[PDB]
Design a protein around this nucleic acid. Structure first.
Lengths: 105, 93, 80, 323, 94, 96, 83, 102, 92
DNA sequence: TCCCTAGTCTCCAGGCACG
DNA sequence: CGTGCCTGGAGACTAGGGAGTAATCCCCTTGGCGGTTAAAACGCGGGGGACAGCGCGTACGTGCGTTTAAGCGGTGCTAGAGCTGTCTACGACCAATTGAGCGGCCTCGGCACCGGGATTCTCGA
DNA sequence: TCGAGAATCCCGGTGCCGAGGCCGCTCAATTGGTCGTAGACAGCTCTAGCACCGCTTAAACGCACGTACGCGCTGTCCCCCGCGTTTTAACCGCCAAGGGGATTA
């Protein structure tokens, strides 16, 4: 039985265990640490992917484009705090037009 | 050589989230970079805590603390809920 | 508690601004300053309590504050 | 008295050399085989041969297994390997080495029939090697080698009386046979600080007299080809032999001839004697060695005896230069 | 005296000094108030309180220096809350 | 004759440059500048094409952030045109 | 095979204008181009010095993209996707 | 001793043990601790020399944190080295804007 | 003692300025500075080693990380002193 | 594959750090 | 001023790193040449943003009388920080072992693109 | 406020390439053992965080009060935006020179 199935997860558990052991991060590595890390990765990936899918539905494109992911990341505030110092290649910027720059007459 | 990435896990998760949504390979690489970034960040935070706690093992308590530290806002509160319950499954065989 | 945010006096804020080299400060500054001070202090105290709870200790240590400040990117010297 | 162990180690060394592409194993196996053949005693245990230098754990285990069972399981399995046998057979032809034979076996070419059928896939050197594969593998008798050396010397003297041609190697050392001819040539006008066509004139003279039959590569310093002594209009033609002629400076010709005279053990002993005498001896010249190991200006070289006296060693004839 | 002369004198006196200029008792009260939002009945070492106070002083000093720089950039002599918001946006805090 | 307003083609394409995600930097000049800058660090060093594209993208990101900061700065001084002094103030406020 | 110089002018005024419009500036003076070139040169030089150092510490002769990613993290930029 | 063998001042063996117990790599070079100690000593030497210059500027024979902070702000390379580090009770470098002046 | 380098700090201070004193707060600040620089250099070296896929911490990566960290003239002088120190340690 | 030098334990001790 | 450990040097044991470069020929790589066409440079209104000065007023420093909370000197008093001694789960490690994952090779529609035609802003009057 | 016109959108149709989809082949997660030990846990001791109280004193708090500087008004001017025009370079393709690699000595 797979350990990720033993936890019910989708991201690989033993892969994370091997990475953590090879990561020279600590002298010893507990069992539930890979479970917690995989769960956090799954939650973050799901949150990003759902927003991306909503954006793509709003963008009427069946595939996910890097601009769609960037727009999703700019849409959420907690993700933006999480990824404020992260740049998305070919992701562009969210539409932000200055109110003073707006033309009025 | 054989290159490792979370592409298959990402695809499975995406199907689990949006059953009818596609994704680009470049987008897959971006997602992989995000996953790697979160992995490295959490690992470094846990290692720093363990050195601060002067412990020689990396515990699930250190993972909960690391998630509480790095993750912001409501994403922090829900994820731990997803963690310990998942941890419960690891303790439920 | 007892409007402790109001504990930062207007003359105290002026003293800090003079240490900050500010030549003239508006009256609305004294409240938004308190707000930002709370924001920084809250974002620091959250991490501090997190560290102390992970330490499973009932007292907040200064080294925990230093570690949190490094986690907040503000390296501080004077505590070890 | 270790002929069988040396023979089984030679073919194992070929596997590391041409197939495994590991000179770091081939050279070690070859040194171990040379030491085993150099020991005039019967090898009974691998530990007994392990006393000799250059023999380690793998070699001792292989020798014990060969003595106990009469063969090696790895050697038996690699000899029966069709890919390994094809690669070894392909590497036997000149111009084909590890990568060449590996690519040929990868492309289905495994025998000389495929080599002849893929002449378009063989370069000029490869084509010459395929054409003279059998001829190159034969030994050259001392009479035939002396005749060809005399013919080459006559051609050189006709090309230039100031040209100096010396047949170094096993023939110079007095061996009854050699696999090829190695001529070291000099010219007084060709020095270390001094014509690019001097070798070209000699090559043209040798090819005009129908001595050199084919040319593999020709430069301003060395030329390599195949030459064969002519038959006297009634006997079978002599087999093709590889002839290489290298042009050396006048101040470097004596050192080059001394180095190419051999033998390897004699060259190593002379170099060790020079190093212990504070000198360094090379194919080009001999130089003093400083107190810090920094080499000074190379000493002038005009004869082998001068080099021998430079390292404070008695001059030895090439027949006595076995070791 | 001349308006500003006292201000500049106090400016130089604060820049020469190195004290905290913050009431330690109110700072402790504020720290405890914020800590009540995170974990009830917690203890704090005194040196930790002084370090947190000093860090707060540093953050406030940097923010105020940035605000004054912005005011000079905005051709204004009095520091206004708009300057504080401009700095916080430029500094990336929020 | 039909000339758009003096601040209307300006307002145009801003949405078009925000909706798009192209490089906007000529790749040959970017590679030439990259090679020029790297030669002063080391002669005869290779840069991968992927490396050049990534470096161009990173420079575009840094310039975009700086320009957005400068726009906000000009709005802070109730101005419209972006000034080099505003860029200097933005760089100082960033700390660079 | 011939080294070249004076490529800072390669960043054309149209390119700067396009980049700024992507940033969203309504009006730009002409002096912005020179200072923008200066800031771009400074940032690129800061990144490229660390990139060349990372390359040479790996004893390679080609500027690798993973090296660029490591440098961007060193400068606290951390572009994703590439590498 | 090892610090005597290198001629440095910081305890090189202490640095070796700190690297060993830092869990930074599987193997740690022996001259790596020497190099790390050398760099630390270099940096400390420059910091202390600037500190002494600043102290004699203030005519005080004790190294004070205010002088340390003033030196750290006063050196361009040092300021860029430790820009995001705060010094307790060090104050700030006196800097009055010209526009503030009358 | 809590594994401090204060004695080395005082020795180096007397080496540079033998006629001046130091505050205890100043000594602690210097100790924290030394610890921070050590940690920064160590993390840079570890990240370089993993990025270079090496399984050992060597002086080459130490010099590489130091050159990464220190500014120009400071990096030149520091690396020079480290090279001289390594030369003296290896030779003697 | 063999080697040789450098990275580990370990193992006391003349001697540095400490209160 | 003893004194209390302690890394420094010396075995004892064990892992990466290099043990061969010259001579000649060939393929991949890279740098230059050329049309061309989008694109950058140039050039010229002009008008709209930048900017300088005037009026003012109100809000912020400024000096001063007052007070009240913050230090600041006591006083005690205990929650818990820290250190100690077991033992025990428990992570690490080893050796099969199989299957999730990976590499290679289709494929068929998602989606860019083009082109026309309908849509709707948009300057001008 | 319409209106010509020009930028935009939508729709149909087209062709092309990559997301996935499959399938054969492995080495990395699983099973199931051991074995030294990290820390878990109980337990004990001192200490510093409270916890409080009386005194002092100065930071602060509230208040007249001037004035200056923020701001809003104005004109005024010139710089850069828009539109057209003229090189031009980059760029894609299309070529040939050398750097690295091959065997072999």
């Amino acid at each position: 039985k797979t350990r990720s199935s033993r936890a019910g997860l989708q991201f690989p558990v033993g892969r994370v265990h091997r990475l953590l052991r090879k990561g020279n991060y600590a002298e010893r590595v507990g069992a539930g640490a890979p479970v917690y890390l995989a769960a956090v990765l799954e939650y973050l990936t799901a949150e990003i992917l759902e927003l991306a899918g909503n954006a793509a539905r709003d963008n009427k494109k069946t595939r996910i484009i890097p601009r769609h992911l960037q727009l999703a990341i700019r849409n959420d505030e907690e993700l933006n705090k999480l990824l404020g110092k992260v740049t998305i290649a070919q992701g562009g910027v969210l539409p932000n037009i200055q109110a003073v720059l707006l033309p009025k007459k | 050589s054989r290159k490792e990435s979370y592409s298959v896990y990402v695809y499975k998760v995406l199907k689990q989230v949006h059953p009818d949504t596609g994704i680009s390979s470049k987008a897959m690489g971006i997602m992989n970079s995000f996953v790697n970034d979160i992995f490295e960040r959490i690992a470094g935070e846990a290692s720093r805590l363990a050195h601060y706690n002067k412990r020689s093992t990396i515990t699930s308590r250190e993972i909960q603390t690391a998630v509480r530290l790095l993750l912001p806002g409501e994403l922090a509160k829900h994820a731990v809920s997803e963690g310990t319950k998942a941890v419960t499954k690891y303790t439920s065989s | 508690l007892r409007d402790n945010i109001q504990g930062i006096t207007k003359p105290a804020i002026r003293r800090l601004a003079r240490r900050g080299g500010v030549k003239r400060i508006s009256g609305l500054i004294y409240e938004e300053t308190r707000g930002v001070l709370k924001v920084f202090l809250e974002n620091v105290i959250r991490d501090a309590v997190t560290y102390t709870e992970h330490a499973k200790r009932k007292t907040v240590t200064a080294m925990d504050v230093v570690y949190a400040l490094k986690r907040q990117g503000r390296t501080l010297y004077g505590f070890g | 008295l270790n002929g069988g162990i040396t023979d089984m180690l030679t073919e194992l060394a070929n596997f590391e050399k041409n197939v495994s592409q590991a000179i770091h194993k081939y050279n070690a196996y070859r040194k171990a085989a040379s030491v085993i053949a150099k020991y005039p005693h019967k090898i009974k245990s691998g530990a007994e041969a392990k006393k000799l230098p250059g023999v380690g754990t793998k070699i001792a285990e292989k020798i014990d297994e060969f003595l106990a069972t009469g063969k090696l399981r790895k050697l038996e399995k690699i000899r029966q390997d069709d890919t390994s046998s094809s690669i070894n057979f392909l590497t036997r032809v000149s111009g084909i080495g590890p990568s060449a034979a590996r690519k040929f076996v990868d492309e289905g070419i495994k025998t000389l029939e495929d080599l002849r059928k893929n002449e378009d896939k063989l370069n000029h050197h490869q084509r010459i090697g395929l054409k003279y594969f059998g001829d190159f593998e034969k030994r050259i008798p001392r009479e035939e080698m002396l005749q060809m050396q005399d013919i080459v010397l006559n051609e050189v003297k006709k090309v230039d009386s100031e040209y100096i041609a010396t047949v170094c190697g096993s023939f110079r050392r007095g061996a009854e046979s050699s696999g090829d001819m190695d001529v070291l040539l000099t010219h007084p006008s060709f020095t270390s600080e001094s014509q690019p066509k001097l070798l070209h004139q000699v090559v043209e003279q040798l090819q005009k007299v129908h001595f050199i039959t084919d040319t593999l590569s020709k430069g301003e310093t060395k030329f390599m080809g195949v030459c064969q002594l002519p038959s006297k209009n009634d006997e079978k033609e002599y087999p093709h032999r590889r002839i290489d002629i290298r042009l050396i400076p006048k101040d470097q010709y004596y050192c080059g001839v001394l180095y190419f005279t051999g033998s390897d053990i004699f060259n190593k002993n002379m170099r060790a004697h020079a190093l212990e005498k504070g000198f360094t001896i090379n194919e080009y010249t001999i130089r003093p060695l400083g107190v810090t190991g920094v080499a000074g200006e190379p000493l002038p070289v005009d004869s082998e005896k001068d080099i021998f006296d430079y390292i404070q060693w008695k001059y030895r004839e090439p027949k006595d230069r076995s070791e | 005296y001349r308006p500003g002369t006292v201000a500049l004198r106090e400016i130089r006196r604060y820049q020469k000094s190195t004290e905290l200029l913050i009431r330690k008792l109110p700072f402790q009260r504020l720290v405890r108030e914020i800590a009540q939002d995170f974990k009830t009945d917690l203890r704090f070492q005194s040196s930790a309180v002084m370090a947190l106070q000093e860090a707060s002083e540093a953050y406030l000093v940097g923010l105020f220096e940035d605000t004054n720089l912005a005011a000079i950039h905005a051709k204004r002599v009095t520091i206004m809350p708009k300057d504080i918001q401009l700095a916080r946006r430029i500094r990336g805090e929020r």
